[PDB]
Amino acid sequence: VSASSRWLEKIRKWYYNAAGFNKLGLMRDDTIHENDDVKEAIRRLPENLYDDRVFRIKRALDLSMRQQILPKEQWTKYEEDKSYLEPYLKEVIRERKEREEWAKK
Amino acid sequence: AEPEHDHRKRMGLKMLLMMGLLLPLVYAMKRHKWSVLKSRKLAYRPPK
Amino acid sequence: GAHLSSPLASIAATNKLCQSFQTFNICYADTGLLGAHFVCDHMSIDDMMFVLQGQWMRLCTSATESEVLRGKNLLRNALVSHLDGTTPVCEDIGRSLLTYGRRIPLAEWESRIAEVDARVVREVCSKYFYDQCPAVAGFGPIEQLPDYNRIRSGMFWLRF
Amino acid sequence: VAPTLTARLYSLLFRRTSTFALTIVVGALFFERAFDQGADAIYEHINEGKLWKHIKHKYEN
Amino acid sequence: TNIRKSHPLMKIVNNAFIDLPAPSNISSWWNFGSLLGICLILQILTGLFLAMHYTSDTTTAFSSVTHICRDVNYGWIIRYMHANGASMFFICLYMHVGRGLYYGSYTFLETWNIGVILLLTVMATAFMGYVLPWGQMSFWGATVITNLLSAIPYIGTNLVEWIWGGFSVDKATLTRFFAFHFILPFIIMAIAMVHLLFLHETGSNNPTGISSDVDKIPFHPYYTIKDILGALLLILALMLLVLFAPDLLGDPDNYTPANPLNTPPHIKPEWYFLFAYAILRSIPNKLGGVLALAFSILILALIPLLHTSKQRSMMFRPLSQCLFWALVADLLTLTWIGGQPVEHPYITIGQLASVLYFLLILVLMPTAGTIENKLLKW
Amino acid sequence: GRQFGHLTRVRHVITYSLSPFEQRAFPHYFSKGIPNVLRRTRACILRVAPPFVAFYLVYTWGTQEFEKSKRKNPA
Amino acid sequence: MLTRFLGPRYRQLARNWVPTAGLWGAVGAVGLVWATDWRLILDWVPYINGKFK
Amino acid sequence: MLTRFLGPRYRQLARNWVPTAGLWGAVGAVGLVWATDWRLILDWVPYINGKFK
Ligand SMILES: CCCCCCCCCCCCCCCCC[C@@H](O)O[C@H](CO[C@H](O)CCCCCCCCCCCCCCC)COP(=O)(O)OCC[N+](C)(C)C
Ligand code: HEC
Ligand code: HEC
Ligand SMILES: CO/C(=C/C(N)=O)[C@H](C)[C@H](/C=C/c1csc(-c2csc([C@@H](C)/C=C/C=C/C(C)C)n2)n1)OC
Structure with a gap:
């Protein structure tokens, strides 16, 4: 039993279905707003994942x-x-925050 | 107050008849141009 | 390079628009493929298409007499150079009989070549190229490959 | 309508941009006549006699 | 090689209106940008042909306007094309700003802030515009708005008198307003081209808010023809309004010459100022009234600082969608109330809607985004 | 500004297009369009309609409360 | 500066383009005639008789 | 978004720039006072007395 933690999860599942990116074949991380941190992380993805990402966005x-x-x-x-x-x-x-911490001292 | 009354209404009929001819025709021009995209098929063929 | 007769070849060479291009007239019974294939850098696809389609249209509308002589001359030379040795000729007998039902003798080819003038070229090029829908196949770094509508728009000229 | 009227309209007029243009401008002149008064005639019927053009002969010298 | 690509004039046109990489999926909601450009040009060509026969003095201002409609050949169409185009320009402005909010387009900081300045300027234009006929609404609308500037602490009266050219909305003010109303649409056009410069630096946003670099199509022929069709609809909406109902949006008071003594019962803005008029009239204080009217529009400059969501668009954001339409329906309320007197049911709900406009943008929609993030475990 | 051939890296995606002269402009205009338009409406009615109803009822009450206020009933 | 443009190719190039250049003139003429209402030219046109006296 | 700007370097960076930021305010003040003729401020100036009654 985890009755509360599965209703607090069931709201999420409800919201997810209501968000409706899944209707267009998308994944949550495909819908993120590309800022510098995001643009960097897209850059760091391995070939397989980056390729799969591009296809989903094209299909969407x-x-x-x-x-x-x-x-x-x-x-x-x-x-x-x-x-x-x-x-x-x-x-x-985590890398940026270390920079921002070093810039403080 | 509004002498042009008859003329505007005469022109308005011509406008409606013009648009009734023009609106479906421009839409048809758009659709045919856009059809290359509206029927396009994608396929993903990743390697290995 | 720069001094090549074919305007496409010279513009290709000068502006390094291209690593290679070739025209073709692939024939099958009652049908074929007429056009060109090229290989080039990612940033040169657009210009290659423009320059190619512009030449098709130039030929469709305004083919001049001397370049048509050169075309005829290149073709007589190609036909006679190809038919050199037992292998190419044996191939020509086999294929010809299967397609034309006979061997078309060389003098007949010369006869049929000599008949082509500027008017013939522009009449015939218009018949096949003018305001016709291309089949287009692209591969590799093709982001800059023109949209079909745009390619299809290069199949006519607003000035003509 | 043997090889289709649209096919013969294409081969005769639409092919070259010159004859295509000429067909539009010749067509724009014909159409302007058949539409101006053709739509005015429909404007006549909804105002059968309430226009000055119909009254006319009532006050004539 | 290609003449259309390398010529120092055709090149600039090619990269803005022809070969421009545009998203494959932009809605009919993206049409309003071009439709604004059409509206701006339409106002210039009707405006000039109106400026040719119009006089700037109190003695002849009202009569020249009549002279245009009655005597000048097809002058009545030019006159109503202008008047209706003015508000047609406003419906496009409203669609365009709305779309920017919904779709997260505002994240383009420079191009968005320029758009706010475009809005203020087009509205500063139209406010100066309506005064020119010198009708009752022209004068008293001019009087009601200018008098607000008396509230600015130490600098108060000297400012209003400076804009007045005297102690009331007088002779000086008409002609002065005409000069400013002639020039401002040109400044608008210049600011609109920078708007387009900053924009082309990123390309358009799309309905999804995900980047479209992976599926770009050329602005011609796809958006040439989509904008051609869209403009035909604009002419339909503008011309049905001109050839069938030229005064539907118009106030009848403006058909009687200005009287600086006899003040009318209702002081009714043209529809595009009604929401803002409401926000202003709701607050009792003088200083606060103007500062709330100012805030009602300058608020759009805050919206980017108040983006809280991990996603760009409202397309996949259900709570934010509800909060958006609450803002539209609330703005529909402010509109209707603005066109109503300050009596019993209208004071309360008008004041209430005012608080809601601000609480919705300043607090409510920024909270929805935080919750929406949390529900996706982001 | 950006141009084609410089936008982004994309690998392994074939696209098949047809000429507009080979296809019809309205394939199944009413047999697919109407199913789609209701589907599109149902997707958004619970997100766009509820504030407009809430406005409409405030509008209809507010105007009804406006007139039914200045007239009296006693002296 | 003009002697470079005279020779047999340009003779062919002019002839190749003349049916077109003639048809654009017909476009311009009909186009100008129609747009200004040149009743001088248009009176002699068998259907366009808007001057119907 | 503002916690990144608080620390000892920024304490030094603010102090380093404050004599300057103060002197630009003095420029702006004198500048505004002089340009509008703020007889409110200028009446108390020992030579500028153009209001010479
Ligand atoms: C800016 C504010 C105004 C707002 C306007 C909004 C309303 C929309 C109207 C805008 C005009 C759009 C026109 C519609 C687009 C159709 C495309 C058209 O331009 O045709 C093109 C070509 O243009 C025409 O061919 C030119 C014809 C010229 C006709 C004359 C026009 C009338 C002007 C009169 C000329 C006289 C000058 C005036 C002298 C005083 C391409 O044709 P295409 O569909 O790709 O077919 C290819 C051609 N084929 C068949 C040969 C292969
Ligand atoms: C601050 C609100 C704002 C106003 C007001 C505004 N703009 Fe924009 N405009 C934008 C933003 C943001 C975009 C980016 C939209 C996008 O690509 O999704 C944009 C896009 C456009 C586009 C490109 C087409 C499109 O719709 O995306 C044009 C053109 C346009 N604006 C011109 C104008 C004109 C003309 C005016 C009236 C003078 C104006 N805009 C008023 C902010 C606005
Ligand atoms: C060439 C100068 C000129 C330009 C440009 C111009 N107008 Fe005007 N406008 C006039 C004149 C003159 C009048 C007065 C005549 C009249 O009322 O029709 C006027 C009238 C108006 C009116 C009063 C409408 C009425 O008849 O009730 C409004 C509102 C208006 N303009 C808004 C605008 C807007 C918005 C723009 C585009 C930003 C603009 N105008 C472009 C000169 C201009
Ligand atoms: C001239 O009077 C009127 C004009 C009209 N078009 O409705 C109405 C009858 C009137 C105006 C209402 C109104 C409401 S709200 C507003 C307005 C005018 S001006 C403005 C600001 C936001 C723009 C400032 C721009 C400043 C730049 C110069 C930097 N808001 N005017 O009703 C009292």
Whole structure:
């Protein structure tokens, strides 16, 4: 049992479905606003992941144009949502903050 | 107060008849130009 | 380089627009592929297309008499150079019989070549190129490869 | 309508941008006549006699 | 090689209107930028042809306007094309700013702040514009707005009198307002080209808020033809308004010459000032009223500093979508109330909506973004 | 400003396009468009409509409270 | 400066472009005639008779 | 977004630039006072007495 922590998770699953990037085949990290830290982390991704990212965005911008979504079966499931960028961006912010700390002394 | 009354309404009919001919025709011009994009098929073929 | 007759070849050479280009007339029974293929750097695809399509149109509308002689001359030379030795000729007999149903003798080729003048070129080039839909195939660093509409717009001229 | 009217309109007029233009300008002049008074005639019917053009002969010297 | 690419005039045109890499997926909501440009030019060509027959003095101001409509051949169309184009220019401005908020376009700092300055300038233009006919609404609308500037602490009266050319909205003011209304659309155009310069430095945003570098298409023919179709709709909306209902948006008081003594019962702005008029009238204090009117527009310069969301667009942001339409419906409220007198139901809800405009932008939408981030575990 | 061939790196994506002269401008205009337009509407009605209803009812009450206020009922 | 433009190729180049240059003149003429309402030219046109006396 | 700007270097950076930032304010003040003729401030100036009653 973890009754609260699965309703606090079920709101999230609800929100995710309401956000609807998954309708356009997208993953959460595909929708992030590209600032310097993000642009850096996109830069640091390995070939396979970067290539997969570009395709998703192309397919998303394609549908967004024809004003469509994917069939239901082919949407991104909340569970199957690979948070592939987070560790890269975590490292870039961690690096930046060390700079910002060194700039203080 | 408004002498032009008849003329505007005469012109307004011509405008409506013109737009009724023009609006579907420009839309048709747009669609055919945009069709190259609206039927485009993508395929991703990553290596290995 | 710069002094080459073909305007495309000379503009290609001067401006290094290209690593290589070649025209082709691939024939199948009742159909074919007529056009050019090129290889170039990422930033030169647009200019290569423009210069190519501009030449097709120049030829479609304003082919001049002397360049048509050079074309005929290159073709007589190609035809006679190709038919050198047992292998190329044996190939020509086999293929010809399968396509034309006979061997078309060399004098007939000369006859049919000599008949082409500037008017013939521009009539025939217009028949096949003018305001016709291209088949386009691209590969590699092709971000700068023109959109189909744009390519299709290069298949005619507003001045003509 | 044997090889289609649109096909013969293309080969005769639309092919060259010159004859395409000439067809538009010749067409724009024809159309202006058939539309100006053609739409004025429809404006006549919705105002059958309430216009001065209909009254006219009531006050004539 | 290519003449269209390398000529020091055609090159500049090519890189702005022809070969420009544009996103494949931009909505009909992206049409308003060009439609503004059409509106601006349309106002110039009707404006000039109006300026040719119009006089700037109290004695002849009202009569020259009539002279145009009645005597000048097809002058009545030019006159109403102008008047309706003015507000058509405002619907496009409102669509365009709205789209900027919804889609996170504002993140382009320079291009967005220039747009705010474009707004203030187009509104400073139209306010000076409506005074020119010298109708009752021309005068008293001019009087009501200028008098607000008396509130600025130590500098108060000297400023209002300086803009007045005297002690009231007089002879000097009409002609002076005409000169400023002639020049400002040209300054607008110059500021609009810098607007387009800063923009082309990034290219357009798109409905998703993700970068479109992976799927760019050339501005011609796709957006040439999409803008051609869109302009046809603008002419439809502007011309239905001109050839069927030329005064629907217009106040009848402006059809009687100005009387500096007899003040009308209702003081009704043209619709595009109603939301702002409401915000201003709601606050009792003099200084505070003007500072709230000022804040009502300069607020858009704060919106970027108050982007809280990890995503750019509202497209995948449901809570933010609700908060946005709350802002639109609230602005629809401020509009309707602005066109109403300061009596019982209207004081309260008008004051209430005012607080909501500010609480929504300054607090509510910045909170929605923080929560929306947290729900995605971002 | 940026131009084609300098925008970004993209690998392994084939795109198949057709000429506008080979295809129809309105493939299935009503048989696909109408299913789509309702689908588009249903996607947004719960996000755009509720403040407008809330405005509309404030508008209709507010105006009804305006007139039914200045008239009296006793002396 | 003009002797470079005279020779057999330019003879062919002029002839190749003349049906076109003639048809653009017909465009310009009809175009000017239609736009200004040159009743001088248009009176003699078998349907365009807006001067219907 | 502002916590990055607080630390000993910025304490030194502010102090290093303050005699200057103060003197530019004196420039702006004298500059505004002189340009508008702020007889409020200028009445108390021992030579500038153009209001010579
Ligand atoms: C800026 C403020 C105004 C707002 C305007 C908004 C309203 C929209 C109207 C804007 C005009 C858009 C025109 C519609 C686009 C159609 C494209 C058109 O320009 O045709 C092009 C070519 O232009 C025409 O061919 C030119 C024809 C010229 C006709 C005359 C026009 C009338 C002007 C009169 C001329 C006389 C001068 C006046 C003397 C006083 C390309 O044709 P295309 O679809 O790709 O077909 C290819 C051609 N083929 C068939 C040969 C292969
Ligand atoms: C601060 C609000 C603002 C106002 C007001 C505004 N702009 Fe913009 N404009 C922007 C922003 C931000 C963009 C970027 C939109 C994008 O690409 O999504 C933009 C985009 C555009 C575009 C490109 C097409 C498009 O819609 O994206 C043009 C053109 C335009 N503006 C011109 C104008 C004109 C003309 C005016 C009226 C003088 C003006 N704008 C008023 C902020 C605004
Ligand atoms: C060539 C100078 C000129 C330009 C440019 C100009 N106008 Fe005007 N405008 C006039 C004149 C003159 C009048 C007075 C005649 C009239 O009311 O029709 C006027 C009238 C107006 C009116 C009063 C409308 C009415 O009839 O009730 C408004 C509002 C207005 N203009 C707004 C604008 C806007 C907005 C712009 C574009 C930024 C603009 N104008 C462009 C000269 C100009
Ligand atoms: C001239 O009077 C009127 C004009 C009209 N077009 O409605 C209305 C009848 C009037 C105006 C209302 C109104 C409301 S709100 C406003 C306005 C005018 S000016 C302005 C600011 C935001 C712009 C400042 C620009 C400054 C630059 C010069 C830097 N807001 N005017 O109603 C009292």
